[PDB]
Amino acid sequence: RRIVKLNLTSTEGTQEKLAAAIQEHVQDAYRFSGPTPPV
Amino acid sequence: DPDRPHIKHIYNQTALARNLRYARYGYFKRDMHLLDVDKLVRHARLLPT
Amino acid sequence: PDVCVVQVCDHMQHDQGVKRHALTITYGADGFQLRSLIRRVRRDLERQLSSTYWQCYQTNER
Amino acid sequence: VFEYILGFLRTNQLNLPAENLQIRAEVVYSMNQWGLLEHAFPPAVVKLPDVCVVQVCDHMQHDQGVKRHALTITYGADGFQLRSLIRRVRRDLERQLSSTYWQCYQTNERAAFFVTTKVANGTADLLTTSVTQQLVEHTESMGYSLASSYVTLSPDVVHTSVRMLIHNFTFRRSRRVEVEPGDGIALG
Amino acid sequence: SPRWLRNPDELCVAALRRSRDVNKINSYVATYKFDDPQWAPLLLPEVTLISHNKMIMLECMSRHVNFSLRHIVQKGHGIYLIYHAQHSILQPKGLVEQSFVTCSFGIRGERLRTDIVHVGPIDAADVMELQPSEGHDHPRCCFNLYQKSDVRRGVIAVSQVEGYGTWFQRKPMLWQRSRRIGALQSQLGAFAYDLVDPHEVGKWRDCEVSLLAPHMRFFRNGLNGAEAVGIIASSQVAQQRRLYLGEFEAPAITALDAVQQLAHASALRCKLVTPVVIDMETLLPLSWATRTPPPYVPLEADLPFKLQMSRPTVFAAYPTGGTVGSPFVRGAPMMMFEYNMHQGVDHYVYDDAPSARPMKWWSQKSNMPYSGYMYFARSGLVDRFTPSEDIPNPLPTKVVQERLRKYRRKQQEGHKQ
Amino acid sequence: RIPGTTKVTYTNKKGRTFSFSVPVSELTHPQVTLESAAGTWREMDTSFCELGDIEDDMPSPVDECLRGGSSLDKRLIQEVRERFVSFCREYVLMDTSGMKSTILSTELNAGPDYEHYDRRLRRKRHWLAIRHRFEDVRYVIWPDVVNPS
Amino acid sequence: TDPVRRDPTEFLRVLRRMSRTTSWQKTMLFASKGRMVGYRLTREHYNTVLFSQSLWGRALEIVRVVRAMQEDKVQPNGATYYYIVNGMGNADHGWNYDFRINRRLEKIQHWRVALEALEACEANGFDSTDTMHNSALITLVIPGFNRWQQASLLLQRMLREDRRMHPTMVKFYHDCLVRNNRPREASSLMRLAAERGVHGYEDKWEADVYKGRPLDSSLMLRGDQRPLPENLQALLEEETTRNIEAERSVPVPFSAGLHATEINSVFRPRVYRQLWYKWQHIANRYRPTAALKRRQLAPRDSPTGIPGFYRI
Ligand SMILES: CC(=O)SCCNC(=O)CCNC(=O)[C@H](O)C(C)(C)COP(=O)(O)OP(=O)(O)OC[C@H]1O[C@@H](n2cnc3c(N)ncnc32)[C@H](O)[C@@H]1OP(=O)(O)O
């Protein structure tokens, strides 16, 4: 269902692109939780 | 990866999973410091002069 | 004083399933050095737990 | 005081009196100022405190109207042999617990734990009494004496139906018949 | 001993003195806090077992002078932010005693332009007194700042800055920044955090180097420009006694240090300065300009940033202009660097669905904390050139009679009662 | 058993030394609660587990025999030989009912799906493991010609 | 991106919620991808993950979490060993009709993984749990696996340590011994369970027919029997071993080389049928599907709110 995107990145930008993609996946996982609301 | 895709057909036109619009250049503008310009020229759709 | 009274009141609360409690120690007299007790408790609890989950200071004298 | 000092001179054995700290410190001061204490007492690891506060807190929940027990034992200071205490407790309980299953173990330094499934009233009372009995025996075997105690029996802050009865014991270290640190204030 | 964190509230300047001349109301004299050992290293040149560096203190002095003067343009505005710092040194050698500040509205009636002229010794060697009572193997040095007649003085530098004194815009500065730090923290895993050897980078110690070697790329051996990913680590700053840090942000001095550093590296690659392969030849800045375009977000310190430079143009009509910002010296060759740095993640998006507006909320932009240009000179040719142009050096009876008359009356009347 | 008491030598103000008596006890539990990496705690061996990791090899008992030890042991030689023979028999008489090897595009940048490890990856991994372990074991089982094990 | 959501506190909070409520793949995915995108994971993160992996009996996921822990140099704390052993104890196993369930479990050697977890906990100095030891023994004697010589030694260590036997452990080990043709050990186990009073086994005490017999060096005689002349006794024992092996060799039809103890022997953990964690159920086969009826839970043409029930 998620639209498949095209990866247009150099041999070098793949590290950062992977980081961003996994961060987006972590946000999609955060959707699991409910609405969000000393030292 | 448009050059060696790990899926049969890269695109599709089902009602909710349309993805041809997201091949536009404007969406790859967000990520330009990482971009591969030849692959962009080859696989981007509404590409300016 | 030749006799001292120490009151330790532990107030237990809980909201939305997270339970907390606050201890209040009070001495009857003033001559006691309570910064030293606070120091000792900090030293003895930094090992048992992180400071993110507890906090001890001095509200005022004694 | 001179009775103790002269007896030590005549027998080459000094036993400081524990109950009367006044006479004990008087003897220590006299012997230090007379320089005879160095002949009386010639020349990871943790120190045992002088006062120890321990407690047994057990949560008694309901499974089918009959209750199951989750009991824990906690000390206030490190250095007390919880593993030995738990071996002793299990050896005691193996004859008395008729529950389907129960286990006990040392959960961390200065703390131990015991879970038993769905005991009846008589068995629960036979459990707690023996747990406290072994706790007191073990702590006193270290050189302590129960100065004070108290009991409480209250519900849980979160769940009303959960009942917890806590025994809180306070022990005073029976000072040994020897010169000990902290007692050095007595000597000049 | 260290104060590697410094709240923005405190400044490095003592109380300023307005001039009494009617036409010099805008003119103030600034005396800097040399007494405090905290500001002593920042307000005095570093001594090498001398470096001639000025951007460590010139920028700090100018910025804090403008911060002090902010009140006459703040008008009670919520926030005050400085920018467009231009500096041109007339004499690379010599330290500074004081400065003269002339303030105006600039162009807009919502900003405050300043003009700082620094006056002090034009030769630090004369004031230097080596090894005074060394005691321990490392002596403590002291400078004689105010000297009667043993020191020859003159203008050493001229700078100009301007503060905007505006409000706190919630959108560009609260919840877009809130998202950008989070995105940078998530991106933190993409980079390799390996430092670089300071010998080929211009610094002496490995404790004051913030430039990741694996992420330093050069085009045609640096002949067309360069890029480098760096991190102003709190660990690096704490055990480094020169620069400090804020609560979250990184000051302009600790942002421009990385620019100077990457410039030194690119100069080595371009064959502009002699490498170490001995003494180190650290190119020094003569004149530099640094601006921050809107939104005037500060440079976050704990998160990485990517710096980018232009090819060095070696000057044997300056491209910038003749005003403050371009060098005011002529002689030995110089090296020009245009630099821009990005602090943010522009490539992260979260397209939950076309129906909503994912781009208006989860889109963002790699901001430009500091942009500008720098002119550098080789450390060996510091004494080769001389200042080009000439700038001049900025250098009760009736009341007493009335008061004595009043006292006459008072003491005369005191008797009658 | 714990000793209970320890002695410490103390010198008074005058300068004479005597013995105190400190009550002490030893620690019995690890102080693991601190989030510190000492580097001394024992770890669990997991090299024997067979995952779907393509960048690894199917672990075999011959792998656990060839531990870089003194191979010049007759009994170890028969053990290695029998384990290798069993591994080869296991490959040859493998039950290949549901096994399928059809080029599937989805598995380009990954191995056969986790749910399809047995039907698609198992036999290929077993063959590669046999070849690799052969490269290690052949000179042990059939040593070159110059009493024999 | 939303610092409230990008907080280590919030990450740990949602991880705890995922472990508490939902299945194991959720915690696996979240922990792995958070770890990749920064988010230093700590021992309580790994414990939260291991809780759900053990609850659902995922041996492979337990192994991967373990490898992640030794990769990150995070020390286990007794609860980790508890969860590792108990989650290896209740892995999916067994046989449907001619169809082995979790045939992949063989090459993992989750039995050795559990044994090494016990070894490491004892070596590092934690107090192992009687349920840990029980779950290890079930792990050894699980229906698809036959390691009874190993399980006997482990049980002997348990008894010398004065630990309790679990009725589930007794059931599994007795079935394994019967499958492996060990009446001596099975009968001794039954007597031991009857004497120790394990609740399921208190009428299962049976006489010892091997009294005064050796374990390792012959022929058993009733007392009213005499050994034949040795030159003839050798011929008889030669004939008897041949006859026993001839009878053993013939294949039994309408089986699958499966012993009766492992025919119709599907096991899935406790959670698989509308139930949740409990400390005393170490290896708890999912309850029979007959417990709940649809028309008893909700009227016709209405959902019963128990998806997945009634499914093997
Ligand atoms: C044939 C039979 O009978 S099988 C019977 C049992 N199995 C079944 O019935 C089928 C069930 N199938 C499944 O559950 C899915 O296929 C599964 C197993 C892939 C779900 O697992 P996932 O949610 O995808 O976990 P994840 O996405 O993190 O993948 C694991 C990766 O995380 C990595 N990882 C690193 N650290 C960790 C960590 N702390 N925790 C988890 N994973 C980690 C692993 O190295 C592994 O690397 P990989 O990508 O090369 O594989």
Shape of chain A: flat
Q: State the total count of DSSP E strands of chain E.
A: 17
- Which percent bin holds the helix content of chain A? 40-55%
What structural class do the secondary elements of chain A suggest? mainly alpha
Helix and strand string of chain E, N-terminal first?
EEHHHEEEHEHEEHEHEEEEEEHEEH
- Termini separation of chain A: 44 Å
Please tell me how large the radius of gyration of chain E is: 25 Å
Q: Given the helix and strand composition of chain E, which structural class is it?
A: alpha+beta
Could you state the order of secondary-structure elements of chain A as H and E? H
The main pleated sheet of chain E reads as: 13 strands, antiparallel
| Quaternary structure state of the chains depicted | part of a larger assembly
- Strand % of chain A is under 5%
Bound molecules: acetyl coenzyme *A
Rounded Rg of chain A = 15 Å
Count of DSSP H/I helices of chain A: 1
Please give the share of residues in helix of chain E.
10-25%
Protein name (chain B): Pentacotripeptide-repeat region of PRORP domain-containing protein
Organism (chain B): Trypanosoma brucei brucei (strain 927/4 GUTat10.1)
Biased composition (Basic and acidic residues) (chain E): 400-415
InterPro entries (chain G): TPR-like_helical_dom_sf
List keywords for this structure.
part of a larger assembly; 7 chains; C: 62 residues; alpha+beta; 1 helix; 2 strands; G: 312 residues; mainly alpha; three-stranded antiparallel beta sheet; binds acetyl coenzyme *A
Would you write up a description of this structure?
Chain D: It comes from Trypanosoma brucei brucei (strain 927/4 GUTat10.1). Chain D: GO terms for molecular function: ATP-activated inward rectifier potassium channel activity; voltage-gated potassium channel activity. Chain D: This is Potassium voltage-gated channel, putative. Chain D: One of its GO terms (cellular component) is cytoplasm. Chain F: Acetyl-CoA binds at residue 115. Chain G: Acetyl-CoA binds at residues 32, 102. The structure is cut from a larger assembly and holds one copy of chain A (39 residues), one copy of chain B (49 residues), two copies of chain C, one copy of chain E (417 residues), one copy of chain F (149 residues) and one copy of chain G (312 residues). In chain A, 44% of the residues lie in helices and 0% in strands. Chain A has 39 residues and is mainly α. Chain A is flat and about 45 Å long. The termini of chain A are far apart. Chain B is an all-alpha fold. The longest helix of chain B has 7 residues, at 37-43. Chain B is globular. The termini of chain B are far apart. Chain C has 62 residues and is an alpha+beta fold. Chain C has one helix and two strands, in the order ββα. Chain C is flat and about 45 Å long. With 149 residues, chain F is α+β, with helices and mostly antiparallel strands. In chain F, 32% of the residues lie in helices and 9% in strands. Chain F has a two-stranded antiparallel sheet with strand order 1-4. In chain F, helix 2 packs antiparallel against helix 4. Classes of the chains: A mainly alpha (39), B mainly alpha (49), C alpha+beta (62), E alpha+beta (417), F alpha+beta (149), G mainly alpha (312). Strand 1 (45-47) of chain D pairs antiparallel with strand 4 (22-26) of chain F, so a sheet runs across the interface. Acetyl coenzyme *A sits between chains G (25, 28-29, 31-32, 35, 64-65, 68, 92, 101-104) and F (114-115, 118). Acetyl coenzyme *A (ACO) sits between chains G (25, 28-29, 31-32, 35, 64-65, 68, 92, 101-104) and F (114-115, 118).
